[PDB]
Design a protein around this ligand. Structure first.
Ligand SMILES: O=C(O)[C@@H](Cc1c[nH]c2ccccc12)NS(=O)(=O)c1ccc(-c2ccc(I)cc2)cc1
Ligand SMILES: [Ca+2]
Ligand SMILES: [Ca+2]
Ligand SMILES: [Ca+2]
Ligand SMILES: [Ca+2]
Ligand SMILES: [Cl-]
Ligand SMILES: [Cl-]
Ligand SMILES: [Cl-]
Ligand SMILES: [Cl-]
Ligand SMILES: [Zn+2]
Ligand SMILES: [Zn+2]
Length: 159
């Protein structure tokens, strides 16, 4: 899931294909919108929700085998993955619905934080070595702005 390509356009589109059973559709839509807003806040990139497969980033929740050659392992383990910039499945973000999706403090994984992380991958970003960075390879819930100086620098170095 490591690429070397970047999007050749800044007006990125995304489509929420389906939803998780853990949260209301309104909460889901809002969580993704806010996740994208983190990246558009520090770059000339924009994110527009669409309802077509022609979208750059197709978002979907799946369980076990879901099309690609990387099935989800169910509870825990892989939480989700996003393919780097490119056509087709590239740029798409998949979330393991066998995981408990929630927000803020408490049990379950924050869909907001995991999505922001995945969108980083969808934009071409690789894992960061900075523990406090959103692109850190390890999930850990914390309060405060998700983007660390390292995340901002990385994304701006691309766009
Ligand atoms: O890192 C990921 O995107 C996925 C997929 C993956 C597995 N190995 C690699 C290697 C390189 C890129 C992606 C992946 N691994 S994951 O275990 O599902 C995972 C996803 C997100 C996060 C994460 C979310 C939010 C914060 I803040 C920090 C890490 C940690 C671990
Ligand atoms: Ca902006
Ligand atoms: Ca795509
Ligand atoms: Ca899993
Ligand atoms: Ca779930
Ligand atoms: Cl659905
Ligand atoms: Cl927010
Ligand atoms: Cl959160
Ligand atoms: Cl932020
Ligand atoms: Zn997948
Ligand atoms: Zn990652």
């Amino acid at each position: 899931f490591e690429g070397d390509l970047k999007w050749h356009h800044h007006n990125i589109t995304y489509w929420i294909q389906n939803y998780s059973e853990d949260l209301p559709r309104a909460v889901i839509d809002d969580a993704f919108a806010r996740a994208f807003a983190l990246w558009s806040a520090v770059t000339p990139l924009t994110f527009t929700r669409v309802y077509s497969r022609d979208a750059d980033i197709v978002i979907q929740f799946g369980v076990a085998e879901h099309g690609d050659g990387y099935p989800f392992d169910g509870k825990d383990g892989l939480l989700a993955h996003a393919f780097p910039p490119g056509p087709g499945i590239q740029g798409d973000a998949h979330f393991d619905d066998d995981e408990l999706w929630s927000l803020g403090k408490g049990q379950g994984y924050s869909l907001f934080l995991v999505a922001a992380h995945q969108f980083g991958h969808a934009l071409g970003l690789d894992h960061s070595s900075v523990p406090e960075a959103l692109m850190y390879p390890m999930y850990r819930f914390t309060e405060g702005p998700p983007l660390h100086k390292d995340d901002v620098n990385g994304i701006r170095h691309l766009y």
